[PDB]
Amino acid sequence: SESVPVLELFSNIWGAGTKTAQMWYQQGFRSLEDIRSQASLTTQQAIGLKHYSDFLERMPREEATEIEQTVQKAAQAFNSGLLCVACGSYRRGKATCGDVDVLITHPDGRSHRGIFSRLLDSLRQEGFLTDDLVSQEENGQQQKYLGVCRLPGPGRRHRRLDIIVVPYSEFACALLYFTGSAHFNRSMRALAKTKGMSLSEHALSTAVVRNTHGCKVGPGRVLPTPTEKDVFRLLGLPYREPAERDW
DNA sequence: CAGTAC
DNA sequence: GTACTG
Secondary structure, three states: OOHHHHHHHHHOOOOOOHHHHHHHHHOOOOOHHHHHHHOOOOHHHHHHHHOHHHHOOOEEHHHHHHHHHHHHHHHHOOOOOOEEEEOOOOOOOOOEEOOEEEEEEOOOOOOOOOOHHHHHHHHHHOOOEEEEEEEEEEEOEEEEEEEEEOOOOOOOOOEEEEEEEOOHHHHHHHHHHHHOOHHHHHHHHHHHHHOOEEEOOOOEEEOOEEOOOOOEEEOOEEEOOOOHHHHHHHOOOOOOOHHHHOO
């Protein structure tokens, strides 16, 4: 087939971008079968190709709830005080979700620890998590999992699921980042940059020092932000509910 | 770098 | 913009 469509075909593989798609085209690959049989694949790339059709589908919002609930009960078995809030497209109220991002924390700020591994293991035993892509357990106090899940029963597709465990100290900035949207987050951190601050999935800092070129040369001091709206306030912004946030 | 998360 | 692993 023509160049542009084939590049698009390859790019829709998880773990494959515009550079990988271009390289594969030079090798002479045109179809997904060519990639599956001849191309050197990353473990992640192998999974994305395996679930190519299912990953292209957006899911009904109801299914996202059904997934968030599946994770929630698995975690709450270990600790019933645990919080489980689905973010991303879901929290912003979209009728469809391309994936599910479940955020987890605990009010005491202690018992959230030691859940991440046990939770994933519990979900693997349940048959819920089917494949794993990336696991980053050295996010400072946060841990993030990138994997694939599938609800039980006939006629179920594989969905992409993100699970994140944060301390209650960072709960505000954690879901502020994960509900998005991406170009909402982009402009809040850009805004803080102007106000001499920095925003992140961990904290909103003030007093951040930047050089003449604006490169950050000193971190600021972390401002305690219990809720989302505390963050909105310190940035001199009118608050936006998540639905307002999609953009 | 490349791809990814929002 | 901020920031993680492949």
